[PDB]
Scaffold this active site. Structure first.
Site, PDB file in Angstrom:
ATOM      1  N   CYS A   1     -10.738  -6.134   0.164  1.00 40.06           N
ATOM      2  CA  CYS A   1      -9.719  -5.037   0.191  1.00 40.06           C
ATOM      3  C   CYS A   1     -10.365  -3.765   0.741  1.00 40.06           C
ATOM      4  O   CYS A   1     -10.716  -3.768   1.922  1.00 40.06           O
ATOM      5  CB  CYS A   1      -9.002  -4.940  -1.152  1.00 40.06           C
ATOM      6  SG  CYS A   1      -7.682  -3.682  -1.221  1.00 40.06           S
TER       7      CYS A   1
ATOM      8  N   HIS B   1      -8.371  -4.748   3.619  1.00 40.31           N
ATOM      9  CA  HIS B   1      -6.933  -4.486   3.505  1.00 40.31           C
ATOM     10  C   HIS B   1      -6.474  -3.830   4.790  1.00 40.31           C
ATOM     11  O   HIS B   1      -7.213  -2.988   5.343  1.00 40.31           O
ATOM     12  CB  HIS B   1      -6.650  -3.503   2.329  1.00 40.31           C
ATOM     13  CG  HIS B   1      -5.217  -3.484   1.977  1.00 40.31           C
ATOM     14  ND1 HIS B   1      -4.300  -2.690   2.637  1.00 40.31           N
ATOM     15  CD2 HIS B   1      -4.559  -4.193   1.011  1.00 40.31           C
ATOM     16  CE1 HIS B   1      -3.122  -2.943   2.073  1.00 40.31           C
ATOM     17  NE2 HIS B   1      -3.237  -3.844   1.099  1.00 40.31           N
TER      18      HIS B   1
END
Lengths: 187, 187
Positions: free
Chosen positions: A105, A125
């Protein structure tokens, strides 16, 4: 001999990206240490889940090295990892010994901060891409999990099982990963 | 006005099935209380993640009622839920007021123990089917998430995002569920 994992847990970490890898790795028979960046004390995660680490990072480091160092995401957790001299030293040492580093992420942006793994293909992400790509030191990927040798990255809460199973496969092999996967009821 | 969720956290709960619903529900703007069955103290989950509850169950109940009561799985967590008179009372009261009850993996077996929702279609983890089906009081489903009115069930770690988003949809509607889902990076 079992494989060992260090999961570095900072305030503002994405709790799903902490617990899914810890739990799946433990299911794989990896010896996992959840290490608190700031000390032994409980950690308030991004969505206010409070997790008690196994050890302080200071203490966990004395018990290394580890077969993998895992960096959860969450923007504020990733920033705390990025700002830590202790994390810099652990990641540098892991890179130097040719050990696996795994980040999910916003977690990979701590690799940028600490100048780890430049020249690798990475994912993050989507919302962390521009930060990760500042300076063009990595090549970006949209794969849900990306692994370029010893740098293993992934995208978000919804890729955490894939991320964790990729770590299991890297450490314990495909067969173990498949065996751990079946009882999870993944689609 | 925001919707409220009670998540009942017992020793041996599946930590992924605790954290994924708590985090996703909070992303949806639901006010979530993580309530410890045994008290205010930290809870040792099935794969040794230690979570600090927001409140004791005793105290959380005084702050109800809740729009949903959520029961994580993990066999030992589910057994502790099943053995608790306090959980019996909370679930009976929730059923009596026509409020949603959501349970995942082995969690639905606590519904059996407390005679909640008989006559409903339900799913569970495959390995919990025979326990859930003792006496034929429910009709079994292999859907990843099953919802028969006010009884919402699901199967395992790998169905936890779907489970959580089904709760979000039930409380806050499809649009909110879709908005919460996109940033998760689900496939």
């Amino acid at each position: 001999a079992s494989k060992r994992a260090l999961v570095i847990l900072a305030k503002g970490a994405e709790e799903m990206q902490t617990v899914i890898p810890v739990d799946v790795m433990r299911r794989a028979g990896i010896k996992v240490t959840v290490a608190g960046l700031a000390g032994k004390d409980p950690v308030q995660c991004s969505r206010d889940v409070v997790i008690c680490p196994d050890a302080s990072l200071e203490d966990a480091k004395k018990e290394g090295p580890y077969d993998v160092v895992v960096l959860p995401g969450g923007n504020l957790g990733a920033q705390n990892l990025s700002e830590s001299a202790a994390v810099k030293e652990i990641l540098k040492e892991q890179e130097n010994r040719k050990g696996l580093i795994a980040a999910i992420c916003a977690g990979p942006t701590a690799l940028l901060a600490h100048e780890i793994g430049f020249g690798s293909k990475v994912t993050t992400h989507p919302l962390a891409k521009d930060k990760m790509m500042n300076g063009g030191h990595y090549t970006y990927s949209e794969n849900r999990v990306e692994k370029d040798g010893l740098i293993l990255t992934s995208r978000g809460p919804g890729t955490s099982f894939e991320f964790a199973l990729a770590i299991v496969e890297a450490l314990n092999g495909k067969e173990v990963a498949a065996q751990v996967k079946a009882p999870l009821v993944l689609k």
